[PDB]
Every structure is written in structure tokens, then in C-alpha cells.
Enzyme design. Structure first.
Site, mmCIF file in Angstrom:
data_model
loop_
_atom_site.group_PDB
_atom_site.id
_atom_site.type_symbol
_atom_site.label_atom_id
_atom_site.label_comp_id
_atom_site.label_asym_id
_atom_site.label_seq_id
_atom_site.Cartn_x
_atom_site.Cartn_y
_atom_site.Cartn_z
ATOM 1 N N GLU A 1 -10.714 73.177 -71.565
ATOM 2 C CA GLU A 1 -11.377 72.478 -70.473
ATOM 3 C C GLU A 1 -10.801 72.851 -69.097
ATOM 4 O OE1 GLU A 1 -8.262 71.506 -70.120
ATOM 5 O OE2 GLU A 1 -8.827 69.568 -69.252
ATOM 6 N N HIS B 1 0.397 68.563 -67.642
ATOM 7 C CA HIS B 1 -0.059 69.100 -68.927
ATOM 8 C C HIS B 1 0.438 70.511 -69.193
ATOM 9 C CE1 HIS B 1 -2.370 65.554 -69.549
ATOM 10 N NE2 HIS B 1 -3.134 65.775 -68.492
ATOM 11 N N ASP C 1 0.549 58.602 -64.367
ATOM 12 C CA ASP C 1 -0.825 59.104 -64.541
ATOM 13 C C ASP C 1 -1.405 58.508 -65.839
ATOM 14 O OD1 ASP C 1 -2.756 61.229 -65.700
ATOM 15 O OD2 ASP C 1 -2.517 61.974 -63.656
ATOM 16 N N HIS D 1 -3.003 59.889 -68.150
ATOM 17 C CA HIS D 1 -2.865 60.780 -69.295
ATOM 18 C C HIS D 1 -1.400 61.025 -69.642
ATOM 19 C CE1 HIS D 1 -6.795 61.745 -67.424
ATOM 20 N NE2 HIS D 1 -7.177 61.747 -68.696
#
Ligand SMILES: NCCCCCC(=O)NO
Ligand SMILES: NCCCCCC(=O)NO
Ligand SMILES: [K+]
Ligand SMILES: [K+]
Ligand code: NA
Ligand code: NA
Ligand SMILES: [Zn+2]
Ligand SMILES: [Zn+2]
Ligand SMILES: [Zn+2]
Ligand SMILES: [Zn+2]
Lengths: 341, 341
Positions: A117, A159, A195, A197
Site C-alpha cells: 500500500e 512502519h 499514533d 497504528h
């Protein structure tokens, strides 16, 4: 407090993101930085400066060299291979695969990616380096004696793992900042990732390291990106034993619940003896965030900043996610107001 | 020889495939089966029959039950989640991830996928079951004493591993056929994968099994899909020690070279004592194949079929890949001519 921000974030202006089986314009787009910068200035944080440029000295201590080499030429190689879209991985080294690194661009982009993504586009590497530089200059301010600073990083970082990009991230800015603080003389540093995530990239980098403590509050990975890390049982390995603290939470979580996890995370950071805290600040915890399921309100961000700063140790705030509405700016500015008040 | 073919293959007619950073019409399209069927009939192979339906008894012995359950409902769940495109995985369980299985469709589609270049579309499960059924009925003919049969499988199978779909594949038809032959009384079976691409799914299924020998000739994974398996050093593990033989080859490989690897693979199979050989036949080794880099000519397929059949052991030919041009049909028919001649 100083705000460190590079206009070179704009070099990452990708055309596409794979979302819901379609190639759509990306959530992580340059308007985010515009919105955030305007809001922090409106809130009185107008000491905004560009970062000095930095080479790879610090980042090589948190990211694999092969990975960084890959990012530096990935776009050029993709284009040279004749592909018409942006650079998007398809094949991944999943369960029971060979550990070998392919030689071609299709194989390597998969090898070095955790999520399809995120497309690599022209200017991505240069933008990532500028964002890293904002994090390094922020860290240098803390190392020099400031008690707070804000690095307006874009693209975000949390990430990006030792040798993977994904989730809109390429260089783990927060990890680089923590490393910079250690290099400048600290022995123990914490990263607190608020955050929505899970910061799986950050966790990966420090999982076996005892010099950095990593705490993350996030949507449960059973039902939220990044899907494959972030469970409470993950507490660290080897020299890093006891230095990861994950607080997965469910749909609709409001501040009354989320703040209890924050309190606990700060207790564990204090018990670890962090000399400073790098805050991975995403405001995708907001009740109107388009891709997230927590229910924080704009006033809650003031509470959050005040609580984190009541740790009594210096803070570097490093920008991560938060999407869709310009109130991402208000929310970030509110964290800074809580820190500064 | 009998040709086993289901019109239900057409239930898989996906609209999109992620290729070169774009969503394009899939290479693995229903017209492939039409081209192949017409060509095999033209070559005199007109004993064409639909398969009997089959349940999950055989397939549960080669694929994970959770994986099969996932495929059953993946489309319905994706659609229910509100996504607008076809079902395409984004996040994957790559290096240093949790082994846990997510609960939502986003997490599960990644958990159960090895490659994002394959979208799940309505009818995919049904089509895959029909293709499996063609492989089972072919195997049953060999079990009953026939020396050759052709299962015109679509979708193909050899990239589907124990618990992951990808590379246009969902159920590993060849693996199911091998299992069926064992269940019907064989003790040792070989699968010979002559498709351009490594049969990583097949390899995964049988890697630790001593009852099946797997040989694959394929583009070097350093520069060819699937990228992360298929090296010569992979020879098996545990109960399967010594039962995988990979023959990676480079760009431009012609029959004069490829046939030498075929000879060696058949020597290995004979030494193993295979009672039958399931041939995973892709004709993407052809010099005009749009996604592949070998240089076989149409006449070479006759040679190939004759050489494989000179093993003197029964063959089930199971359709895999081969794209782009209607000559895929001639090429498949030519293998069958070599077998039957
Ligand atoms: N493309 C799916 C969502 C990626 C995560 C973005 C984020 O905000 N991470 O913090
Ligand atoms: N979409 C990338 C190529 C997938 C290979 C398909 C194939 O023919 N496997 O045998
Ligand atoms: K987090
Ligand atoms: K092969
Ligand atoms: Na650590
Ligand atoms: Na085996
Ligand atoms: Zn100061
Ligand atoms: Zn986020
Ligand atoms: Zn017969
Ligand atoms: Zn193939």
C-alpha cells in the site's frame, strides 16, 4: 519551542496508493504538512527552521545498509525496467521462503517491503532524507539542552523496520532521533508511539536492544494495520528483554480508556530510566480520522501533551500520521500546547 | 487420452491484476482455456469430459483448513467491508512478524497471500473448486490404470502453498492430484513442474514429505517470479530430505539447455521410484510468452512430451501457465502429441 521542517517533504508527492483494491491518490500527501505547519504557527509556534542536511552516519545504526542502498536507486531501477506505474511490490518473502536477496528490481522491492500500500515515486528518497534530517536536528536540540522541540517529519517513519519500507514510511525518523540522542551522550532513551497504528518498524529496530525502550498505544493488530505485530505479549528479546510495551486497544476507544494506557506507558518509561522521550506523534487517533477507529477529541490532545511532558524529561515530538482533515493541524498544535503550557 | 475440463473455470474472471504499478486486465483470463481446448481438439484430443464434483477430502491433506475456509468467504467479507475494488492484499507477514492470524478481512487476506498480483473476485472459489475437480478426475483415471490424461485446470495451482494463494493460483491442483494418487494406493509419486515459474506452492506442500518427489525447471528466482524460493540448494527437510530438485535457469534459455535439465530431473525421479508423474505443464516457457524469458519453440513441446513419457510411468498432465497468444494452445497440444505418439 523550535519547529524543524523541510520544504523538501514535497519531493514525495506520489500519485497512487493501493487501497481497497484500487489505485487512489495517497492519504499521506503534501497538504498534510501544509495543514500542520499552518496550525502550529497559528498556535504561536512560529520559530520554524529548516534542518541542516545530514548524511547516513546516524541512520546506518538503525537501518540495514543494503536496505538504504536499495531505496537510493529503487525508482531509477523501476523506471529502467520499463514499468509504467509507480514502484509497487507484489511478491513478498512470507512464511517458509528462502532468505536470499533477489537481484532484480521486482524481487528486491518485495524483499525490502512490508506492505504494498506504499508506492515508491520519484523524489521519495530525497524527501525521506529531508524528513530524517528534521528528526536529527530536533534530536540535536534536545541533546544540547532544550526540553522540547517538534520535528515536522514527512514522510512519516514508524512502519519502516530494519530493512523494510511500508505504511507510507521509508526511514524511521523516530529511531534515527533516538539513535542520535544516544550518539550525543545518552545511555537510555524511550520512544513513545501515540499514533493510532502500531510502530512495527520502530519495534523491529529496537526489539533486541536494551538502550531504547519502545511503548506503543494502537489499534489492535487483529483488526488494524500493520496486522502482524503489536500484540501485548511482545516484550522484547535478548538484550532487549522487557523493553517493548504494546497497548493494543479496540474499536471506539475514547480518551478515558486510552489515557489509562498512556499513564501506564509513562510509568514503564520512568522505571526504565529514559533520559529523554521521542514521541512518535500521529493524530490519526482522532474521532474523524478516515482510516482509524479511536475517538479522541481535539481537547484530548492538550491533555496528552501535558501528561507526557509531566514525565519531567525532555521531549522530541516527531510527526507520524493523521489524515483527511485540516484539523490534523489543530490536533498536533494542541499536543504542543500541552507540552509547552 | 481423456481431457478433463470444467466450464466453471469462467467463474473466475477477475477484472484487475497489479502489474508494473498499474491495475491491468489479468493475464490469467478465461480465453486461455478456450484457446487451449480448441487446440487440443484440433490435434485429435476430442475425448473431453467435465469432472465430477468433489468435496474437500483430498485437498484438506495438502492445504491448511483455515486457509480453505478463508478462501470460501474472502470475497463476501471483502465486499461486506465496503471496499470498492477487487480483493487485493496489502500487508504481509514478512521477516520478524508475529505468527498470529488476524481476525479481519484486511489482515487475513495478507496472512493467506504470498503475492499481491492476484486479486480475489466473485466466483474465484467456485472456479478453483472446479479446477481442483478436473485434477482429481484426471488422477482417478491414472489410479484406475490409464497411462495418460490431461486435466485442463484453470485457475492454475502451483503457486498455492500450504496456506497461501498468489501467482494466479488458489488450490494447488497438481498437489491435490498427487495426494489423490497416494490415497488410491500409490506409495511414491513425483510432480514435475515444467512451467516457466518455480512451483513454490507445490514445493512448500511437499518439502517435508518423503512420499512425493518435486522437480522444477524455472527462471532463476534471483530474477523471476516467485522471487523467494526455487534455488538449487533447496533439497528438502525432515521426512522430505532429498526430495526437492530445483533447476533454475537464466535469460534466453533454449531447449538445448532446458532439455538437459529435463533429462536430469527424470533421472532423479526414476531413482526415487515414482509410480506416476504429475506434470505441472505451463507453456510460458515459449519464446513469445509476454511475462517470461525462456526461448522454447512450438516443436520443442513435442520433444518434451515424448521425453517425459519415455519414463515409462503413467502421466497426469495438469495445466498451469502460458499467456498472451493463441499459440499457447498449439504448445499444450504438442506436449500431448509427444506423450501420445
Ligand atoms: N495503507 C493502510 C494504512 C497504513 C498506515 C498509515 C499510518 O498512519 N501509519 O501510522
Ligand atoms: N504476476 C506475476 C507473475 C505470476 C506468474 C504466473 C505464472 O504463470 N505462474 O506459473
Ligand atoms: K502507536
Ligand atoms: K517450473
Ligand atoms: Na529495546
Ligand atoms: Na517431498
Ligand atoms: Zn529551549
Ligand atoms: Zn498512523
Ligand atoms: Zn487409457
Ligand atoms: Zn508460469
Amino acid at each position: 519551542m523550535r519547529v524543524i521542517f523541510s520544504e523538501d517533504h514535497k519531493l514525495r508527492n506520489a500519485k497512487t496508493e493501493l487501497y481497497g483494491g484500487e489505485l487512489v491518490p495517497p492519504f499521506e500527501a503534501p497538504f498534510r504538512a501544509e495543514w500542520i505547519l499552518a496550525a502550529v504557527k497559528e498556535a504561536g509556534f512560529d520559530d520554524v527552521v529548516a534542518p541542516a542536511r545530514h548524511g547516513l552516519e546516524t541512520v546506518l545504526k538503525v537501518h540495514d545498509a543494503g536496505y538504504l542502498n536499495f531505496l537510493e536507486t529503487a525508482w531509477d531501477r523501476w523506471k529502467a525496467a520499463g514499468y509504467k506505474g509507480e514502484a509497487i511490490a507484489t511478491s513478498f518473502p512470507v512464511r517458509r521462503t528462502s532468505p536470499r536477496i533477489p537481484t532484480d528490481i521486482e524481487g528486491q522491492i518485495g524483499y525490502y517491503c512490508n506492505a504494498a500500500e506504499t508506492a515508491i515515486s520519484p523524489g521519495t528518497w530525497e524527501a525521506a532524507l529531508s524528513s530524517m534530517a528534521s528528526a536529527i536536528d530536533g534530536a540535536d536540540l534536545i541533546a544540547a539542552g532544550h526540553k522540547a522541540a517538534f520535528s515536522l517529519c514527512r514522510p512519516p517513519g514508524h512502519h519502516a523496520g530494519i530493512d523494510m519500507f511500508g505504511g507510507y514510511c521509508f526511514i524511521n525518523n523516530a529511531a534515527v532521533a533516538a539513535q542520535r540522542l544516544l550518539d550525543k551522550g545518552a545511555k537510555k532513551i524511550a520512544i513513545l508511539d501515540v499514533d493510532f497504528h502500531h510502530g512495527n518498524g520502530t519495534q523491529d529496530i529496537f526489539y533486541e536492544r536494551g538502550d531504547v525502550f519502545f511503548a506503543s498505544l494502537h489499534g489492535d493488530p487483529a483488526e488494524a494495520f500493520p496486522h502482524f505485530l503489536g500484540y501485548a505479549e511482545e516484550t522484547g528479546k535478548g538484550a532487549g528483554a522487557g523493553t517493548t510495551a504494546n497497548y493494543p486497544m479496540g474499536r471506539g476507544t475514547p480518551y478515558s480508556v486510552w489515557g489509562e494506557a498512556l499513564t501506564d506507558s509513562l510509568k514503564r518509561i520512568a522505571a526504565f530510566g529514559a533520559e529523554a522521550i521521542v514521541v512518535s506523534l500521529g493524530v490519526d487517533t482522532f474521532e474523524q480520522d478516515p482510516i482509524s477507529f479511536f475517538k479522541l477529541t481535539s481537547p484530548d490532545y492538550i491533555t496528552m501533551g501535558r501528561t507526557i511532558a509531566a514525565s519531567g524529561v525532555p521531549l522530541l515530538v516527531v510527526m507520524e500520521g493523521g489524515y483527511g482533515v485540516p484539523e490534523i493541524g489543530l490536533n498536533v498544535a494542541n499536543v504542543l500546547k500541552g507540552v509547552a503550557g
